[PDB]
Amino acid sequence: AIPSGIDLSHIDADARPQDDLFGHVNGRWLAEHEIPADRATDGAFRSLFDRAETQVRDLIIQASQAGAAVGTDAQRIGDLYASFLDEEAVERAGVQPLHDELATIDSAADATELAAALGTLQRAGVGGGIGVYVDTDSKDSTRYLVHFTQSGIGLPDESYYRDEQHAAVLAAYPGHIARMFGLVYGGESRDHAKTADRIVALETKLADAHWDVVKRRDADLGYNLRTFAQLQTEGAGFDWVSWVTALGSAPDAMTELVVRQPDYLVTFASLWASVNVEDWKCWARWRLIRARAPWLTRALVAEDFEFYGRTLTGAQQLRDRWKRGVSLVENLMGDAVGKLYVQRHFAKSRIDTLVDNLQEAYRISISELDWMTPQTRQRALAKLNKFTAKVGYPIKWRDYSKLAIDRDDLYGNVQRGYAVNHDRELAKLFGPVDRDEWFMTPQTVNAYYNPGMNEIVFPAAILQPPFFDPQADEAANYGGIGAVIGHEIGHGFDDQGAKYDGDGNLVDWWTDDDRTEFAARTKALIEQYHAYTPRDLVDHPGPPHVQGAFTIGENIGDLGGLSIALLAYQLSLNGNPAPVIDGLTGMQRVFFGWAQIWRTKSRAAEAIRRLAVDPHSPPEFRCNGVVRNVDAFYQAFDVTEDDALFLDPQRRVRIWN
Ligand SMILES: CC(C)C[C@H](NP(=O)(O)O[C@@H]1O[C@@H](C)[C@H](O)[C@@H](O)[C@H]1O)C(=O)N[C@@H](Cc1c[nH]c2ccccc12)C(=O)O
Ligand SMILES: OCCN(CCO)CCO
Ligand SMILES: [Cl-]
Ligand SMILES: [Zn+2]
Numbered sequence: 001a002i003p004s005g006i007d008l009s010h011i012d013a014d015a016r017p018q019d020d021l022f023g024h025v026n027g028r029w030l031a032e033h034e035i036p037a038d039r040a041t042d043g044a045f046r047s048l049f050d051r052a053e054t055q056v057r058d059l060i061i062q063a064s065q066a067g068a069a070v071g072t073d074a075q076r077i078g079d080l081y082a083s084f085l086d087e088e089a090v091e092r093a094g095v096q097p098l099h100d101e102l103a104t105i106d107s108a109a110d111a112t113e114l115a116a117a118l119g120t121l122q123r124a125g126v127g128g129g130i131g132v133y134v135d136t137d138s139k140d141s142t143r144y145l146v147h148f149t150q151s152g153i154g155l156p157d158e159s160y161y162r163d164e165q166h167a168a169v170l171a172a173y174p175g176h177i178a179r180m181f182g183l184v185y186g187g188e189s190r191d192h193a194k195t196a197d198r199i200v201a202l203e204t205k206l207a208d209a210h211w212d213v214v215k216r217r218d219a220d221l222g223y224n225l226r227t228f229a230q231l232q233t234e235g236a237g238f239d240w241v242s243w244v245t246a247l248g249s250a251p252d253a254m255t256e257l258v259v260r261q262p263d264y265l266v267t268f269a270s271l272w273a274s275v276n277v278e279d280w281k282c283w284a285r286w287r288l289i290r291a292r293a294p295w296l297t298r299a300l301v302a303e304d305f306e307f308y309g310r311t312l313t314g315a316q317q318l319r320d321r322w323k324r325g326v327s328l329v330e331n332l333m334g335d336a337v338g339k340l341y342v343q344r345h346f347a348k349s350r351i352d353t354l355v356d357n358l359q360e361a362y363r364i365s366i367s368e369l370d371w372m373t374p375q376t377r378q379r380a381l382a383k384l385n386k387f388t389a390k391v392g393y394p395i396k397w398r399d400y401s402k403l404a405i406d407r408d409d410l411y412g413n414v415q416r417g418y419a420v421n422h423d424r425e426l427a428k429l430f431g432p433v434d435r436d437e438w439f440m441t442p443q444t445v446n447a448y449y450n451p452g453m454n455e456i457v458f459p460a461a462i463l464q465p466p467f468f469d470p471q472a473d474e475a476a477n478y479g480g481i482g483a484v485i486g487h488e489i490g491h492g493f494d495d496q497g498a499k500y501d502g503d504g505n506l507v508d509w510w511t512d513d514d515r516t517e518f519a520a521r522t523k524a525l526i527e528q529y530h531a532y533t534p535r536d537l538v539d540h541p542g543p544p545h546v547q548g549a550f551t552i553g554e555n556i557g558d559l560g561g562l563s564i565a566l567l568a569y570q571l572s573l574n575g576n577p578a579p580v581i582d583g584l585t586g587m588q589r590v591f592f593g594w595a596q597i598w599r600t601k602s603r604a605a606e607a608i609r610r611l612a613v614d615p616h617s618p619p620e621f622r623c624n625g626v627v628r629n630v631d632a633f634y635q636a637f638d639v640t641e642d643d644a645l646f647l648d649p650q651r652r653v654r655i656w657n
Contacts, residue, residue, distance in 0.1 A: 004581040005476025018643035022623040025595035040313035043600030048445045073336040076405040083410035084325040097411035115239040119246025125418030126291040136452040141504035146257040150264045153203045158210035176307040209267035214549045219496045224259045237273030314603030332417035334441040335398035342393045358485045361568035379509040386502030388455040393442040449491035452504035456488040479593020482565040490560030494553040563657035587636045598623045629653045
């Protein structure tokens with residue numbers, strides 16, 4: 001027999017799927033599975049992460065004991081690893097490796113020199129007041145541009161500095177900063193209390209200028225093209241020139257650039273002039289101390305974990321030394337690790353067939369969209385036909401020749417590592433656009449849509465059970481990887497993705513009538529998810545609730561994904577009745593497939609963190625919140641007005657479905 005690909009060993013026979021699909025398919029696991037002490041989240045995704053984490057660790061070791069010549073990626077990976085595991089050597093170095101970079105700050109006599117200092121440090125992986133990256137020009141996908149984004153704060157979001165939901169965390173933050181300073185400088189936390197309070201005051205002024213997560217994902221409000229000269233006039237009070245130079249570039253590197261949040265930029269520059277440089281200096285020390293804390297003493301690592309792990313996320317203990325060594329190798333040389341990973345651990349063909357199926361189902365479904373004009377449908381079909389798919393792994397691999405690794409210098413390795421990756425990013429500006437480039441490693445258990453290249457990408461490691469099983473009946477696969485594929489396609493059509501044409505440029509390809517109706521359906525979905533509270537959070541003050549306006553894009557993805565996966569499945573039967581397996585109809589197994597890939601739970605603190613900063617809906621809602629808008633769900637499970645999940649046909653949302 002062909003296995004069904006649906007796990008039934010964790011079913012909750014007493015949670016009716018009409019009332020609670022998520023609980024029906026996943027209940028026993030939700031009620032019994034203990035989250036490991038070194039984690040805040042466990043489930044499907046973590047299960048595959050862990051498997052891949054071991055394999056990589058083997059590969060680092062199998063590259064380490066290899067006796068490779070100094071100068072090879074085999075050498076860099078091995079010794080960078082060993083940099084980290086020699087806990088003993090790191091311990092005896094104490095707080096000394098922090099000395100030079102910190103003296104960079106302490107030696108700055110005024111605001112001009114502190115901007116220079118900060119540049120240097122940001123180049124070496126330290127956070128600043130402004131985040132910097134290089135992406136394509138929203139209005140011309142044939143050129144790269146530098147983007148400036150809001151930063152400067154030490155908590156997950158701007159909302160931690162005002163909203164009561166986060167007051168406990170906000171109360172504990174100063175205590176922590178003071179503790180860290182005491183470990184770096186000596187004395188006790190009490191001595192460093194004025195320092196902490198001044199730092200928290202400043203971040204709070206910074207948080208005030210920050211756009212929230214809803215406003216922040218508007219592609220339109222986020223596109224603010226400026227010339228370098230306008231940057232200087234508009235945000236006077238900060239030395240752009242010496243800052244940019246220290247980052248490693250020129251008022252010649254790019255004359256145009258993109259400012260994601262103009263009014264933030266202006267308030268940052270202003271506060272740079274008006275606030276005392278010694279306040280700014282304390283803020284800088286804290287940017288550095290935090291950025292460097294995982295590379296130092298046991299005592300600085302533990303205290304960093306107490307706040308950034310236990311208080312923000314509920315995680316109980318530190319990850320074992322070797323887990324953390326693997327992250328280091330991943331952040332700095334992910335592409336090299338990825339080269340070895342795919343020769344060792346990789347049905348690229350059978351994924352291509354599903355992608356094609358989903359693309360065809362989307363094509364058919366857009367063709368019959370009754371709520372919009374023939375006009376915009378056609379344009380919507382043009383976009384979909386310009387889709388590009390990337391499966392498994394990259395064609396080109398990143399060059400690491402400019403990177404030197406010392407087995408007895410972890411700190412140095414980290415610095416050099418962020419500098420080289422930063423230097424590679426800026427060199428992008430001088431050439432044309434890399435369209436063979438990937439933005440995740442093949443060992444990453446996730447997937448993405450890139451608007452600017454109009455492409456969907458699927459790293460090798462997502463092409464595994466429960467998403468994809470080459471041995472299984474296809475229903476589980478359409479419900480898993482099929483829907484994932486649907487979700488990435490749908491991103492190109494969500495409330496923001498739809499603003500980009502097939503060439504990756506911000507253009508309106510709609511009429512106003514079609515925009516209005518589209519906004520109507522968007523509003524209805526926003527309003528639905530605003531009313532959702534995670535079941536593990538029902539008695540919390542508020543209660544906490546899903547941010548319907550933040551999660552919208554993701555929710556459109558999810559709804560398009562699964563509906564169109566169902567359609568594609570029906571079409572693959574060619575008119576034959578779907579095989580019945582393990583008691584379940586073909587359609588029912590697709591929904592169980594969708595439900596089982598969302599098998600995930602989190603500690604209360606991490607769930608609240610996510611409600612704030614994660615544009616994905618909580619898993620229970622990605623499951624239950626999607627299906628109640630899908631008519632096939634009501635057919636599959638005989639759902640009536642008496643069932644919890646029931647929505648009146650008139651209140652169901654239908655967008656690309
Ligand atoms: C449908 C799915 C299989 C892939 C899908 N990625 P996609 O939403 O296209 O895009 C993801 O989120 C975007 C906002 C980011 O910009 C991307 O980098 C990417 O992380 C997603 O829901 N990702 C979640 C799920 C997830 C992946 N790994 C996890 C580990 C723990 C918890 C959840 C996850 C996430 O990134 O968070
Ligand atoms: O992938 C980890 C989850 N992530 C979602 C955004 O992609 C949460 C933010 O830290
Ligand atoms: Cl360019
Ligand atoms: Zn998504």
